[PDB]
Design a protein around this ligand. Structure first.
Ligand code: CLA
Ligand code: CLA
Ligand code: CLA
Ligand code: CLA
Ligand SMILES: CC1=C(/C=C/C(C)=C/C=C/C(C)=C/C=C/C=C(C)/C=C/C=C(C)/C=C/C2=C(C)CCCC2(C)C)C(C)(C)CCC1
Ligand SMILES: CCCCCCCS[C@@H]1O[C@H](CO)[C@@H](O)[C@H](O)[C@H]1O
Lengths: 121, 51
């Protein structure tokens, strides 16, 4: 278990927690108890931008991009209700957290694409 | 004196300054190539090799 000073400057602060290869279990849901997501973390590893072609009869593809705003991209400390629905499905309702990050990526040739990477609401 | 269309004949008997002049000419040609490529890169649109 690491402390801030073990972490600071390493880039680890922009990475979500992981689980081992042995974590292939199952978490029981008790339909009478209420549940919440105490922490949701989302760590982007690829940004792709759909090309905007002239012909408009070719299917446009998503192409790779270069991140230029450094290790500032992850969503974390997100929390909310985890409902158990009548049909046994679960619904997560986001309520709060660091749930947006501005991001600028660059396409081949230099065009910069800013976006608000988010899962708000 | 030498008329204007003969000024470069001073190099005929001067191998070293002939090499200098050839070096300067080579410098200008290579410089044109570099500048020409930069100008084309500053104006080329790479987004559509089809049309
Ligand atoms: C490798 C090519 C080459 C070289 C090294 C020479 C070298 C020479 N020439 Mg020859 N010549 C050539 C090709 C060449 N010539 C070609 C293609 C033609 C037909 C156009 C001639 C017709 C010719 C004539 C009629 C005479 C020479 C003369 C001479 C001597 C004097 C040149 C001088 O002082 O000019 C000085 C030139 C100026 C001060 C200004 C010239 C301005 C030009 C015309 C306009 C702009 C040119 C521009 C920068 C060129 C860009 C490059 C181009 C290839 C794209 C010198 C030995 C003279 C000689 O025999 O003296 C005894 C002479 O009377 N040449
Ligand atoms: C490859 C090009 C080249 C080279 C290596 C030489 C080399 C030589 N020249 Mg020649 N000359 C050239 C082109 C060249 N010349 C051209 C194009 C002209 C017509 C203007 C002349 C006219 C000329 C004369 C009248 C004389 C020489 C002479 C000589 C000898 C002494 C140097 C000198 O005085 O130059 C002087 C030449 C210049 C300073 C040429 C500069 C003119 C151009 C237009 C400059 C442009 C550069 C600028 C940064 C770009 C403009 C871009 C535009 C969009 C604004 C040396 C062997 C001398 C010599 O020894 O006589 C016995 C001499 O008296 N040259
Ligand atoms: C060792 C044998 C040797 C070699 C390898 C060369 C090579 C060359 N000579 Mg020749 N030359 C030689 C013997 C040789 N020469 C002898 C014994 C004489 C009688 C003196 C001549 C008389 C002669 C004349 C009058 C001229 C040449 C020119 C040239 C060049 C034309 C190509 C050019 O400029 O490309 C473009 C250049 C490059 C791609 C870069 C090359 C980088 C060089 C090789 C590094 C230089 C470092 C080195 C210590 C400098 C001395 C080199 C010298 C041995 C050539 C080329 C480098 C012409 C020239 O120099 O034009 C500018 C020219 O006008 N030579
Ligand atoms: C195979 C390739 C090749 C060859 C053989 C030559 C040969 C020559 N070049 Mg070079 N050049 C080349 C490629 C070449 N060039 C390239 C790719 C560039 C980059 C664009 C240059 C840029 C260049 C410059 C800047 C200069 C030369 C010059 C010269 C001449 C030097 C010897 C001399 O005194 O001529 C005496 C001159 C002549 C015999 C007249 C040549 C006339 C040509 C063939 C066409 C002229 C067109 C028109 C009358 C004037 C131009 C119109 C104007 C509105 C621009 C010689 C004719 C020099 C020169 O001409 O000095 C006076 C010079 O200043 N060249
Ligand atoms: C010194 C030095 C350096 C720098 C360099 C440089 C920067 C260069 C440049 C160069 C250049 C930048 C060059 C250019 C050139 C150009 C040219 C040479 C051109 C010419 C032209 C012409 C000749 C034309 C003609 C004509 C006309 C005008 C019209 C139409 C017709 C014709 C085409 C004829 C370095 C850093 C490396 C280091 C070492 C030292
Ligand atoms: C020795 C000259 C070096 C100059 C290099 C400039 C960067 S390279 C330059 O970058 C632009 C924007 O990314 C592109 O649009 C263009 O196609 C490319 O040539």
């Amino acid at each position: 278990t690491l402390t801030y000073d073990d972490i600071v400057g390493t880039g680890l602060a922009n990475k979500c927690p992981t689980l081992d290869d042995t974590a292939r279990g199952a978490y029981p849901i008790d339909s009478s108890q209420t549940y919440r997501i105490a922490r949701l973390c989302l760590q982007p590893t690829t940004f792709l931008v759909k090309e905007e072609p002239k012909n408009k009869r070719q299917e446009a593809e998503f192409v790779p991009t270069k991140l230029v705003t450094r290790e500032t991209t992850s969503l974390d400390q997100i929390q909310g209700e985890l409902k158990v629905n009548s049909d046994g499905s679960l619904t997560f309702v986001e309520e709060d957290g660091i749930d947006f990050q501005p991001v600028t990526v660059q396409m081949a040739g230099g065009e910069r694409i800013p976006l608000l990477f988010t899962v708000k609401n | 004196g030498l008329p204007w269309y003969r000024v470069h004949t001073v190099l005929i008997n001067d191998p070293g300054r002939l090499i200098a002049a050839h070096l300067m000419h080579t410098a200008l040609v290579a410089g044109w190539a570099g500048s020409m490529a930069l100008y084309e890169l500053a104006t080329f649109d790479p987004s559509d090799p089809v049309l």
